[PDB]
Write a protein that binds this ligand. Structure first.
Ligand code: MG
Ligand code: MG
Ligand code: MG
Ligand code: MG
Ligand code: MG
Ligand code: MG
Ligand code: MG
Ligand code: MG
Ligand code: MG
Ligand code: MG
Ligand code: MG
Ligand code: MG
Ligand code: MG
Ligand code: MG
Ligand code: MG
Ligand code: MG
Ligand code: MG
Ligand code: MG
Ligand code: MG
Ligand code: MG
Ligand code: MG
Ligand code: MG
Ligand code: MG
Ligand code: MG
Lengths: 63, 107, 153, 397
RNA sequence: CUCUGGCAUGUUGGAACAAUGUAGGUAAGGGAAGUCGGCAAGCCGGAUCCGUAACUUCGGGAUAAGGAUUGGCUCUAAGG
RNA sequence: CGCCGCAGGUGCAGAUCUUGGUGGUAGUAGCAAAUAUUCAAACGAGAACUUUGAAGGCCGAAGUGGAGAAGGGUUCCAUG
């Protein structure tokens, strides 16, 4: 539907960027009916919203 | 029949020859789309995201020369769409392109 | 309300109009002149051919600066275009006309566009910004359209 | 006032409406003058531009610096399979010019000729000349036809033969044939009419039309360049680097007071695709094609009696953007208008060749058949693979 | 050039790749003959080691001018 | 409104007149500063442009990032 509020709010409760918030493309309805923190927190605890790992900037070459 | 599946190789190099640097991979995708339409006859071809990744694998201006795709005309009796046959285009990874024919693959 | 050119038989005719439509008046008038006189099935298939760019609308009066097309040799002329918005507005009005015809109970497979005209509507006013602190008009050219179909085979 | 420094006219005014040609073939527009003392012959032919190469010959020009020395000259190859005469038209000269009196066609006209008669052969029923060959096979139509022949004999002054090329022998995509009127010269009208109706429905080779080392004229359509500006189209001088509204212009188009742009100033427009008629093109060699006596033979092409190899006129990898020559060809000296695959009218000269530059018998020493698809360095495949020895693919084979 | 963070190409898209443009390149052989005028473009360029003239207010000029070297890899000395 | 009298802010083609309206131009010029988008799905009557996922990219810490002062005044946030 439209998950801008959920993306912003998940970035808030996960302390990262919206580029790092991953929303489940299959559970779009269960994400879309989450208009609050603690609903975002429940979704994080059950793994429908995931913080993505940082893209690697290695130092092996310069080392 | 109409639930048919074949495997082709596409010379993206000759289909892409001459186009600008910032347009080569999108041009390659609509060339693949036209190729699939003409090898089948169906509009509503659907390009697989792995095929999109394979086309865009070396960025926007160094598109692979030959790609190996699998075309499959399949039934559309899951939406009430005006055409009963769509075509899914998937991506077949290979090592060499030598002696590679167009091949009908089984069910 | 009050059509120009009332028909010969207001029991075998059906009519439809539309006012203050945001399509270009010049493009819709050329499309209307191309559509005039046709049978209803031929007119619908033709307008869908226009929107798929398989058949052109020949621009005969409002033709200044209009490019040349190989599809105008059917309507033997040199300038033609493919007015998409005009085609879809005329298709909406044509299907409203066939709905009126089936409502008043006529054979819809034998209707012919006997009358169609496009009038200018009141202009709606926007702005554009110019070089030395000037503001120029950015008007739109909407149109009223009316048509009368007639049962004849 | 007074343009202050003399410079000649840019470009020629004898060549303009500088527009696209209305034809693709190339109209003759002037055949050689007729004298009935000569034998009966044709005066033109229709070939196709294959490509270019170069030759080596020894020059016999007394007093010249290259006397009895070997030179290298560029040549153009024109593929000329024999033309089929399928019709005959007669002309009577009137005080309004010269009008066509009567055409007679032949029975059994070929499908590429009928392809010329149609604009869409795919959707047609191919019905052309069916009622005509009916009157050929009939007997009431037959006496009508000989009556037309006799009327043409007693009234016409100029007869021409309608002949088409046979495109099934060419490497081209085009299956539609090219028709042409070729004037028949040298005799009385009765003599040339019975000669042409003898040659009706029949093949005529370029060996019979033209000859060795004569000078002919080439008529064709110049290679097409599209919409060009005045610098490419008329070769006017480019304006200096600090010119505000463009450099590649003509800075002044006429004075104030003829008050109009004249027709003789340089303007932008179409360059190329122009009908040109170039003269004095010397024939260097007439080829012989790919005949089959046994296990066949292609040395009758470029084997020049000083190399004695077994190579054809074709380079390695064939002629670029053309294909390969398997028919009778004509090797002309120099360059020739048009693209590759462009059809060339070739016709006999209408001057008289009394010049020591002309009337000269040539003799080729060498014909270069290296690849034109790059900087090719081998003449034949045998020479290449003998120089290189076995390769990796040959070894695994 | 990349990470964290951010974005969707700066008020539209599609198809072609003519002239004329605007911006950017390249060019045989000549080398300012171009032009009011070397305008514009080009040449040179960092660092290390040499070597630097007239003139001078003795401070400078001065990076004057001019020349050589410069990568990768494997070591050896010296400097706490 | 006609006739007899009476009284005028009493007759327009112009004034680069004034105010208002409408043309041709013309479906024309134009929607070209700062590298770039693409595939699939969802919602929806309707998707080049919304949202989600994947890819390819850019800003590249003197940022197209995170916060403030002037200034703005509700533009903030949800829903439609
Ligand atoms: Mg104009
Ligand atoms: Mg503006
Ligand atoms: Mg301003
Ligand atoms: Mg003079
Ligand atoms: Mg200036
Ligand atoms: Mg070459
Ligand atoms: Mg851009
Ligand atoms: Mg955009
Ligand atoms: Mg903006
Ligand atoms: Mg140079
Ligand atoms: Mg040089
Ligand atoms: Mg100079
Ligand atoms: Mg000078
Ligand atoms: Mg000078
Ligand atoms: Mg300068
Ligand atoms: Mg000095
Ligand atoms: Mg070294
Ligand atoms: Mg007054
Ligand atoms: Mg007035
Ligand atoms: Mg007046
Ligand atoms: Mg325009
Ligand atoms: Mg524009
Ligand atoms: Mg970057
Ligand atoms: Mg900030």
């Amino acid at each position: 539907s439209m998950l801008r509020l959920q993306k912003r709010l998940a970035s808030s409760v996960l302390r990262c960027g919206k580029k790092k918030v991953w929303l489940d493309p299959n559970e779009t309805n269960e994400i879309a009916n989450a208009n609050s923190r603690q609903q975002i927190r429940k979704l994080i605890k059950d793994g429908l919203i995931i913080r993505k790992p940082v893209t690697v900037h290695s130092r092996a070459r310069c080392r | 029949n109409e639930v048919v599946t074949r495997e082709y190789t596409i010379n993206i190099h000759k289909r892409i020859h001459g186009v600008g640097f910032k347009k080569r991979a999108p041009r390659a995708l609509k060339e693949i789309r036209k190729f699939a339409m003409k090898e089948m006859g169906t509009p509503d071809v659907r390009i697989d995201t792995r095929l999109n990744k394979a086309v865009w694998a070396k960025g926007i201006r160094n598109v692979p020369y030959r790609i190996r795709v699998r075309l499959s005309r399949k039934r559309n009796e899951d939406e009430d769409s005006p055409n009963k046959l769509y075509t899914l285009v998937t991506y077949v990874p290979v090592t060499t392109f030598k002696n590679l024919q167009t091949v009908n693959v089984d069910e | 309300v009050r059509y120009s050119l009332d028909p010969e038989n207001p029991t075998k005719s059906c009519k439809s109009r539309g006012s203050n439509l945001r399509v270009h008046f010049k493009n819709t008038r050329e499309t209307a002149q191309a559509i005039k006189g046709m049978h209803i099935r031929k007119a619908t298939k033709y307008l869908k051919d226009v929107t798929l760019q398989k058949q052109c609308v020949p621009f005969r009066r409002y033709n200044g600066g209009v490019g040349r097309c190989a599809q105008a040799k059917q309507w033997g002329w040199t300038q033609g275009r493919w007015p998409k918005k005009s085609a879809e507005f005329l298709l909406h009005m044509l299907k409203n006309a066939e709905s009126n015809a089936e409502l008043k109970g006529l054979d819809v497979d034998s209707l012919v566009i006997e009358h169609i005209q496009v009038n200018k509507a009141p202009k709606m006013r926007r702005r554009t910004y110019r070089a030395h602190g000037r503001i120029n008009p950015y008007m739109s050219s909407p149109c009223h359209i009316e048509m009368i179909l007639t049962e004849k085979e | 006032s007074h343009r202050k420094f003399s410079a000649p006219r840019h470009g020629s005014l004898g060549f303009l409406p500088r527009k696209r040609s209305s034809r693709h073939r190339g109209k003759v527009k002037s055949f050689p003058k007729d004298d009935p003392s000569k034998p009966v012959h044709l005066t033109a032919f229709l070939g196709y531009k294959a490509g270019m190469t170069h030759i080596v010959r020894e020059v016999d020009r007394p007093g010249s610096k290259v006397n009895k020395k070997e030179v290298v000259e560029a040549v153009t190859i024109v593929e000329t399979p024999p033309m089929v005469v399928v019709g005959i038209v007669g002309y009577v000269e009137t005080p309004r010019g010269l009008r066509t009196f009567k055409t007679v066609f032949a029975e059994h006209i070929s499908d590429e000729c009928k392809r010329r008669f149609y604009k869409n052969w795919h959707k047609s029923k191919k019905k052309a000349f069916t009622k005509y060959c009916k009157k050929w096979q009939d007997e009431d139509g037959k006496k009508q036809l000989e009556k037309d022949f006799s009327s043409m004999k007693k009234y016409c002054q100029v007869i021409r033969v309608i002949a088409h090329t046979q495109m099934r022998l060419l490497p081209l995509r085009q299956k539609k044939a090219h028709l042409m009127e070729i004037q028949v010269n040298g005799g009385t009208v009765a003599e040339k009419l019975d000669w042409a109706r003898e040659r009706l429905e029949q093949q005529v080779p370029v060996n019979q039309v033209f000859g060795q080392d004569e000078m002919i004229d080439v008529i064709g359509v110049t290679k097409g360049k599209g919409y060009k500006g005045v610098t490419s189209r008329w070769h006017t001088k480019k304006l200096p680097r600090k010119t505000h509204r463009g450099l590649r212009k003509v800075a002044c188009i006429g004075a104030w007071h003829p008050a109009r742009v004249a027709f003789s100033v340089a303007r932008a427009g179409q360059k190329g695709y122009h009908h040109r008629t170039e003269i004095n093109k010397k024939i260097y060699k007439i080829g012989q094609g790919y005949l089959i006596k046994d296990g066949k033979l292609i040395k009758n092409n470029a084997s020049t009696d000083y190399d004695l190899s077994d190579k054809s006129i074709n380079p390695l990898g064939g002629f670029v953007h053309y294909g390969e020559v398997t028919n009778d060809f004509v090797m002309l000296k120099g360059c020739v208008v048009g693209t590759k695959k462009r059809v060339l009218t070739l016709r006999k000269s209408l001057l008289v060749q009394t010049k020591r530059r002309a009337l000269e018998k040539i003799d080729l020493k060498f014909i270069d058949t290296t690849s034109k698809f790059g900087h090719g360095r081998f003449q034949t495949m045998e020479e290449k693979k003998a120089f290189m020895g076995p390769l990796k693919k040959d070894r695994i084979a």
